[PDB]
Amino acid sequence: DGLTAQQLFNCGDGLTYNDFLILPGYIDFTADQVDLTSALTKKITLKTPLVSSPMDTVTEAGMAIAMALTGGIGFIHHNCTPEFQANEVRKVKKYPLASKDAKKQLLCGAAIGTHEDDKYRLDLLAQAGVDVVVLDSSQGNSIFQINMIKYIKDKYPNLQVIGGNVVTAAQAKNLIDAGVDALRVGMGSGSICITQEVLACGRPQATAVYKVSEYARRFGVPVIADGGIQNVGHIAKALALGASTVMMGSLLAATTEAPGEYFFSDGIRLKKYRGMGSLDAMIKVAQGVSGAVQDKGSIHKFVPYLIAGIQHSCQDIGAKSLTQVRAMMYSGELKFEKRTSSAQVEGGVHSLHSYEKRLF
Amino acid sequence: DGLTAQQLFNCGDGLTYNDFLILPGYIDFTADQVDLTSALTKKITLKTPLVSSPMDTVTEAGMAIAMALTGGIGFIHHNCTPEFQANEVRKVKKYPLASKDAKKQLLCGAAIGTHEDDKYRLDLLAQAGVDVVVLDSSQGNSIFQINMIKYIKDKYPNLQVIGGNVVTAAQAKNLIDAGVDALRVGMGSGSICITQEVLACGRPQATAVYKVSEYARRFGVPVIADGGIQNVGHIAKALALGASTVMMGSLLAATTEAPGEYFFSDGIRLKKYRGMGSLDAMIKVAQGVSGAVQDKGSIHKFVPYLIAGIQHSCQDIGAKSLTQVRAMMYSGELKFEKRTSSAQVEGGVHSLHSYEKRLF
Amino acid sequence: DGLTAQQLFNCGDGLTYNDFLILPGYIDFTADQVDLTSALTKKITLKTPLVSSPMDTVTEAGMAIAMALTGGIGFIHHNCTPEFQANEVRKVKKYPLASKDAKKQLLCGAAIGTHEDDKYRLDLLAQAGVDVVVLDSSQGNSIFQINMIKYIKDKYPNLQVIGGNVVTAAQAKNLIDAGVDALRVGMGSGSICITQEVLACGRPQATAVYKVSEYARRFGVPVIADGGIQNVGHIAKALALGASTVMMGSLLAATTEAPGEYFFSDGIRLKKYRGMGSLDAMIKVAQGVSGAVQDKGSIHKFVPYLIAGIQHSCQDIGAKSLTQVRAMMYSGELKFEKRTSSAQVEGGVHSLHSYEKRLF
Amino acid sequence: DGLTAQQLFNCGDGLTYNDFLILPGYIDFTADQVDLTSALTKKITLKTPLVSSPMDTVTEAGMAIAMALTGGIGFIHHNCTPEFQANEVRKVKKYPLASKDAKKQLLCGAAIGTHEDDKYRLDLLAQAGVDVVVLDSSQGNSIFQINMIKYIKDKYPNLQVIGGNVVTAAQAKNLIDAGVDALRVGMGSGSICITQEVLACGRPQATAVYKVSEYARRFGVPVIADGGIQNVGHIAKALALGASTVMMGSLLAATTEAPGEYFFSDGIRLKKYRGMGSLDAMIKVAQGVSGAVQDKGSIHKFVPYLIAGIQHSCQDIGAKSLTQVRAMMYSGELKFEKRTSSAQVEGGVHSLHSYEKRLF
Ligand SMILES: NC(=O)c1ccc[n+]([C@@H]2O[C@H](COP(=O)([O-])OP(=O)(O)OC[C@H]3O[C@@H](n4cnc5c(N)ncnc54)[C@H](O)[C@@H]3O)[C@@H](O)[C@H]2O)c1
Numbered sequence A, B, C, D: 001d002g003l004t005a006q007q008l009f010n011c012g013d014g015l016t017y018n019d020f021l022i023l024p025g026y027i028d029f030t031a032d033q034v035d036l037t038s039a040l041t042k043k044i045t046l047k048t049p050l051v052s053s054p055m056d057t058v059t060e061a062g063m064a065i066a067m068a069l070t071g072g073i074g075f076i077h078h079n080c081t082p083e084f085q086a087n088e089v090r091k092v093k094k095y096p097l098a099s100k101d102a103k104k105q106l107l108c109g110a111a112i113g114t115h116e117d118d119k120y121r122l123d124l125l126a127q128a129g130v131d132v133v134v135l136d137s138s139q140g141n142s143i144f145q146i147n148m149i150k151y152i153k154d155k156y157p158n159l160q161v162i163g164g165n166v167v168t169a170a171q172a173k174n175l176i177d178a179g180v181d182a183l184r185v186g187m188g189s190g191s192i193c194i195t196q197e198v199l200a201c202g203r204p205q206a207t208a209v210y211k212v213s214e215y216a217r218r219f220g221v222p223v224i225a226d227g228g229i230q231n232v233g234h235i236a237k238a239l240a241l242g243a244s245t246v247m248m249g250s251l252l253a254a255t256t257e258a259p260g261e262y263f264f265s266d267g268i269r270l271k272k273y274r275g276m277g278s279l280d281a282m283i284k285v286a287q288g289v290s291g292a293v294q295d296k297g298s299i300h301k302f303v304p305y306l307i308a309g310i311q312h313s314c315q316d317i318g319a320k321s322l323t324q325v326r327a328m329m330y331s332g333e334l335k336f337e338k339r340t341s342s343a344q345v346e347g348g349v350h351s352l353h354s355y356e357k358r359l360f
């Protein structure tokens, strides 16, 4: 009855989060007894598996503080001067589940590129007290990224470095050999991303998260699942497939703590959201779009809802912690099954004249 | 020519009712010679395979009386004070194919939870003379449900108990060992249900109905197929896959006997219909939506139409009774075949400028 | 390179006409050198493979005359008094590729049921000079149809009888043993049919046409492909899969010779079209809808377009006659390939702001 | 990890460009170091892989000059007098990556049919100095085309002849034996083509491009991929599957250099675009539609964008030239993976209220 993850993904099919479900297990505990403790890198641990994306319409100091206070972490974007990014990290560091360091200050992440401006940008961020840095690229398996990783681990031996983006075990081997402390996974699955239309390169997100995690777990390197998360079930699926944490953009967009002001159109409230490879953000080929997302309220209200939903999902599948979810996934005890297009219709809201969908 | 059910469902695919058809057989009898007699539990038998769902917008005493008079049964909902549910059961018991007990009163079902308030609710329902009780949960394979079943079978040895919801043979083993008299099958396939999108857990309904019934038939325990029934063909498919009875919500919603008033919107008549896990019905995470369904008239006219349609379907496939349909299915005499997206388009109404679809 | 029909259909998939294509061959002749001569029954031959459906919104004497004059045949419907159907057959018989009998009168077909009124209806049609009769049923594998066939072949040994509808080789065995002269194939594929929705019984049309023809060719019994023909490519596919002739409803509906008046709605011209199992046409369960189809002009203009299109299709696949098309299909010389949903999008009109589709 | 092209296309599935992706490789060079040099025929080489289609709404002398100046080539259409086509070729020959001949004049292509008017049309095009000629047919594997090829290679031994259209290795064998210098590939995949609807004959474009190229590479004969190119990723996929050059219609339609005037509808600017087999372009059966495409600016701006996009795609997959892309594809070093319908949705723009899509 059911299929194990190894035989679900080694079929060669192009599986996404919407193409499968997890089969229910046995329940002998309540939902809020479930532990969501998660390893971000080899040496940084969070109370929750949630990470904010380093985009200029998603993460500044206000978003980073709110994610850290709710038990996650925020990565500040680099579409600004080195001075500005360092000042934002300083505001986070100088501000029950809160994510904190050895001095009891909030944890903060930052993003950098792989050019020579980024070697100076790194120094300002290290002086500002950054806890972890992510090399922000579409295709992280490059000589430019490998030279940047080898430079950082020599200059600042204490710093935690996240490599990527990657979608295959061959790409992960080079970055793990180069000494990264974690891997960012996904290519083209993001809500605002058109990289697969424009360059024919990418991967369906569920098989990518599963494949890279199966290779990376052998070296003690955790995986961050990034792009294409639309709901709490997508977070549960990403963690169940081997990811240690989940990074999101559009799902945290249009919250009170996200950068940019609110506006009105068609009688409803909106906030701007755009890809870092859109012409708006940057002979010059575009890799993303710019648009808008509906208002979602404060992260101090929305993150507790995601936490309750992940706990309820772990209870339905029979696991007391995310560590136990991944252990029963790799051992073949957790079970999955595919969905046909008809099953996807049967699984959504159907056969009603009209309906109202409130989540919490 | 064609595939048996055993080789149709052991392929590992995510099959739903819309993904297959039943191949025609040989006809040597008229349609109204077909017998629809069905076992609800180990000791309760109905003239028809139809069951009303225990939802607050579907089953109260008026709905339960009409279903029993038409040869089916109604399960009264528990989103009310225990006094009110016992009084509704009392009104059903105080009221040619009618479903009745040894005292010649109509048969009545009731629903309860698995908390400690439900031990008191159970005693009032037993006082009121209830014939069968269903433990109403999204994931019935739990210590809470198993302790509730073992308590009921000791306190009232005469009472018939229905377990679930379940979608796998591993879940059914625990409830059959605990002593249930029938199993409720389905998770997330309901018209008003978003559990699969919020918690990533569930199963396509046709494979769930087929697999739980194949395990349960060996212990003499019948199966009730619940959620995702849109038409008479779905009822015929559910019974052909091994189910003894079929439970529906939205298909019996907006009938004259269902609870709640009628109202007009967009020039047409409607009645409210909602999931028991919707915020409207019940820090708190929603598992269903609330909406509306178009008016359908009285169950005293609508149920006879479903009965005639199931008889016509049994005639087309060559069987004189539902018992014979399940016997031909398990022996490999009955045949099935898959449908691609193009076959589903060819099977619906197509190639017309406009059309009118009256069923009876 | 490519797949033979035997290995395309013995995969167990639910294939429809839209799910595959025919691979091109070698051309050494012009398009109008192709011969479309087709056997309707064991003793009736037509210049073309086209047959009009016996529906009350499709075939009366005017349609039957035009179909016969253009090289096909028309089957008159039975939703009228036996007197009226016999008078319509009389008007066809009383009237360069024209379909004619030994007396040089036009050929005419008629439809009858399997009840005892039909034994009298048959005699009026036989005296009216009918050339062939079809038993008009949704599921022709019945004791009622077998007794009717055995009665007709004894009463009128000269009469040609078409059995069906069938979709499997097991159904065809009984009717071929009973002595039918041809088989009508298809169940639920028609434009106005909801039999699969309501009774769960039917079959995808391309696999049904292929499987019944493969069994029937061994006894010299031809096959008529009926229901779900939307364009000339569907006619070419039906003939290539083993059918001797193709029957259509909606494709010949709203022509000048079809019964019923024209009317205007939404600024365009329409004619009524309905299923024989719709409540409009006939305690009672509906098996079809009633609607409308856009005007197509005269059959004396429209049938020549279908003839030219089938000749062009035979030229592209490399065959000088329909006999040679079926010979290369059964020998494995003709090749086919499957289509994914994306291939169906690439195969239709795509990537335009607006367009106009003119066929001839 | 991933599938090679040989095992992706030998599955028998109906694959299109949208049904797969290319997995990323290793990067150790910048994007504008990538070489796009491409062989058009056995003796003509271009700086870029881009070709203009010979359609009356796409290629006249203005379009041919602009494509040649940007490093590609244009084929002039033949839906005009032979005198007019020769005069257009004359204007192209009379006019840093520019495509040129031994006399340092721009390269020019022309189209001809397989009738006896075309033997005279050929002589005027040779008079005018044409560099290459394409035999313009829907099904090029015919006695008419083979006699035309054998006539041209004897009359003008210096002329380069392109055969087709073909979609199978059996069709290519006859034209390669006849002595063609290149093959045009595709049937029914074009934006304005309904050949698969009307004649049931054609092939999904990605499998056709891959299979004809695998057979043709053994004889040193290059392949031109024609029809169904919607974006830069489609060009990258076509070249990666073995094509030497890519031909497009709709993607170059509504540019400043394309023939026909601009017009306004619904507040936007448009230009007419139609299939050569539409009734507008030419008892007669249509094989294409006529419509409109939105304005796209000058080819001197649009072609550089396509060049930058193909270079970026080659960089993401790890290749310094198109020659190396095809070498990694045939050796099994390049990797691909399939996409389910859900993966195609995840890969496009999703989960936004509104968005703006600018490419450059
Ligand atoms: N799937 C994804 O994750 C994805 C896809 C597209 C864009 N994006 C987002 O958009 C942003 C842009 O991504 P990107 O990949 O263009 O960033 P990038 O700076 O790596 O890309 C610039 C290009 O210049 C080249 N380059 C990079 N570093 C270099 C160096 N040191 N020397 C010489 N050449 C060098 C690379 O080949 C690269 O294609 C990213 O921050 C990312 O978050 C993400």
Ligand SMILES: NC(=O)c1ccc[n+]([C@@H]2O[C@H](COP(=O)([O-])OP(=O)(O)OC[C@H]3O[C@@H](n4cnc5c(N)ncnc54)[C@H](O)[C@@H]3O)[C@@H](O)[C@H]2O)c1
Pocket (backbone or CB within 6 Å): A027, A029, A030, A031, A315, B113, B114, B115, B116, B136, B137, B138, B139, B144, B165, B186, B187, B188, B189, B193, B195, B275, B276, B277, B287
């Ligand atoms: N697929 C489905 O069938 C489905 C899915 C969702 C909701 N529903 C409907 O919505 C209603 C709500 O379903 P539900 O599963 O939330 O009901 P429930 O009362 O079982 O759920 C409440 C939660 O509290 C916990 N719990 C239950 N009994 C307990 C006890 N005795 N002690 C301690 N903890 C206990 C359980 O872990 C459960 O998740 C149901 O009546 C059902 O009809 C159905």
Ligand SMILES: NC(=O)c1ccc[n+]([C@@H]2O[C@H](COP(=O)([O-])OP(=O)(O)OC[C@H]3O[C@@H](n4cnc5c(N)ncnc54)[C@H](O)[C@@H]3O)[C@@H](O)[C@H]2O)c1
Pocket (backbone or CB within 6 Å): B027, B029, B030, B031, B315, C113, C114, C115, C116, C136, C137, C138, C139, C144, C165, C186, C187, C188, C189, C193, C195, C275, C276, C277, C287
């Ligand atoms: N897929 C299809 O081809 C399809 C499906 C539905 C309807 N239809 C059309 O609608 C019309 C109605 O079809 P139908 O199958 O209902 O016709 P029918 O007269 O065969 O059906 C009437 C019912 O009465 C019973 N019956 C038939 N003859 C009998 C006899 N001699 N004695 C006792 N009982 C008998 C049969 O079991 C049948 O279900 C047909 O003419 C057909 O063209 C076609």
Ligand SMILES: NC(=O)c1ccc[n+]([C@@H]2O[C@H](COP(=O)([O-])OP(=O)(O)OC[C@H]3O[C@@H](n4cnc5c(N)ncnc54)[C@H](O)[C@@H]3O)[C@@H](O)[C@H]2O)c1
Pocket (backbone or CB within 6 Å): C027, C029, C030, C031, C315, D113, D114, D115, D116, D136, D137, D138, D139, D144, D165, D186, D187, D188, D189, D193, D195, D275, D276, D277, D287
């Ligand atoms: N998939 C495709 O590539 C496709 C499909 C349809 C149309 N088209 C376009 O439309 C145009 C029309 O295509 P077409 O195939 O009809 O051109 P065509 O001139 O080859 O077709 C005319 C028909 O006449 C016949 N014929 C051709 N040459 C002959 C000769 N010398 N003697 C006797 N008979 C002869 C052929 O059988 C052919 O079907 C083409 O230029 C093409 O670009 C393309």
Ligand SMILES: O=c1[nH]cnc2c1ncn2[C@@H]1O[C@H](COP(=O)(O)O)[C@@H](O)[C@H]1O
Pocket (backbone or CB within 6 Å): A053, A054, A055, A186, A188, A189, A190, A191, A192, A193, A194, A195, A226, A227, A228, A229, A247, A248, A249, A250, A251, A274, A275, A276, A277, A278, A287, A288, A289
């Ligand atoms: O412009 C872009 N194109 C493609 N991907 C991008 C772009 N900008 C950001 N991304 C990715 O998109 C993710 C956010 O996707 P989302 O959570 O689905 O909304 C980011 O974390 C990046 O991995």
Ligand SMILES: O=c1[nH]cnc2c1ncn2[C@@H]1O[C@H](COP(=O)(O)O)[C@@H](O)[C@H]1O
Pocket (backbone or CB within 6 Å): B053, B054, B055, B186, B188, B189, B190, B191, B192, B193, B194, B195, B226, B227, B228, B229, B247, B248, B249, B250, B251, B274, B275, B276, B277, B278, B287, B288, B289
């Ligand atoms: O809130 C909810 N979420 C999910 N499933 C529910 C909920 N409430 C009821 N159900 C299920 O939905 C079924 C009715 O589904 P329907 O017949 O498709 O309309 C019920 O019998 C329950 O099994």
Ligand SMILES: O=c1[nH]cnc2c1ncn2[C@@H]1O[C@H](COP(=O)(O)O)[C@@H](O)[C@H]1O
Pocket (backbone or CB within 6 Å): C053, C054, C055, C186, C188, C189, C190, C191, C192, C193, C194, C195, C226, C227, C228, C229, C247, C248, C249, C250, C251, C274, C275, C276, C277, C278, C287, C288, C289
């Ligand atoms: O009411 C009905 N329900 C289902 N099938 C029918 C009905 N009436 C006619 N048919 C079938 O529909 C065919 C016509 O289908 P069409 O060519 O697709 O429009 C007829 O020849 C019959 O086989």
Ligand SMILES: O=c1[nH]cnc2c1ncn2[C@@H]1O[C@H](COP(=O)(O)O)[C@@H](O)[C@H]1O
Pocket (backbone or CB within 6 Å): D053, D054, D055, D186, D188, D189, D190, D191, D192, D193, D194, D195, D226, D227, D228, D229, D247, D248, D249, D250, D251, D274, D275, D276, D277, D278, D287, D288, D289
């Ligand atoms: O009328 C027609 N029907 C079918 N295919 C055609 C027709 N006219 C041109 N073609 C093909 O369509 C291609 C252009 O397709 P596009 O690039 O997708 O817009 C041409 O290069 C021809 O191969």
